[PDB]
Design a protein around this ligand. Structure first.
Ligand SMILES: [Cl-]
Ligand SMILES: [Cl-]
Length: 232
């Protein structure tokens, strides 16, 4: 792609790590919004949510400095960023499908249909605000890819042991982002503007029940056991 021409070495690797993959339902499973899942099975929002959790972990391992960190620092970064990463990935792929929510291949729902599947007016409001920022920022493919790595390398992550290393790793990503926006658009200010406009659901605890869909994600799949398995 023409975009990688304005990236540095780290920037090319982060674009090639593909944080833009989209979750899918199992092969041959048709989705019909009118035909309820209710009673032994889980709905498509959760199926896609769990598929995406696995994809986020798979992406994180391709991020240069991640595997060098000790297992508990990798576990801390993922736990802290899962909500922000899911929100960023979802909002970005929704942009051509607006006003609908594009949860995954074969699943595009209006905001009203999301409510019947697990979401509440509170989670709808958060997604609305997150899409609005990406639209304002006018984020391109490269910028989205780099933003995923910036969200991952969060130095204030709870239970993080090697804070200076994550700070330096975030620094390396910041350098790739300013390098890119300067080389392609020749606007020194663009990197700082997108970084200041980006919502961060960690400033105020995401446990505020406005976007506590992570409790359903952590409860059903027992995320701690799966993360250890995937990072081993
Ligand atoms: Cl995909
Ligand atoms: Cl430097």
């Amino acid at each position: 792609s023409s975009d990688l021409f304005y990236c540095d070495d780290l920037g090319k690797t982060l674009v090639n790590s593909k944080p833009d993959l989209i979750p899918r339902l199992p092969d041959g499973q048709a989705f019909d919004v009118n035909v309820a899942p209710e009673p032994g099975q889980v709905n498509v929002m959760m199926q896609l949510g769990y598929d995406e959790l696995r994809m986020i972990i798979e992406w994180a391992r391709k991020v240069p400095g991640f595997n060098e960190l000790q297992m508990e620092d990798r576990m801390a970064l993922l736990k802290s960023s899962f909500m922000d990463l899911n929100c960023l990935r979802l909002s970005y792929r929704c942009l051509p499908w607006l006003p609908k929510v594009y949860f995954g291949h074969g699943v595009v729902l209006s905001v009203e249909e999301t409510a019947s599947l697990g979401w509440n007016r509170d989670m709808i409001t958060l997604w609305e605000q997150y899409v609005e920022r990406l639209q304002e920022m006018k984020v391109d493919h490269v910028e989205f890819c780099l933003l995923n790595a910036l969200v991952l390398f969060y130095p204030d992550a709870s239970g993080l042991k090697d804070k200076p290393k994550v700070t330096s790793l975030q620094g390396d990503v910041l350098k790739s982002l300013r390098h890119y926006t300067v080389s392609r658009f020749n606007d020194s200010r663009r990197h700082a503007k997108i970084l200041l406009r980006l919502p961060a659901l960690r400033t105020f605890s995401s446990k505020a029940l406005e976007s506590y869909l992570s409790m359903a994600l952590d409860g059903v799949l027992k995320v701690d056991e799966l993360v250890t398995e995937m990072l081993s």
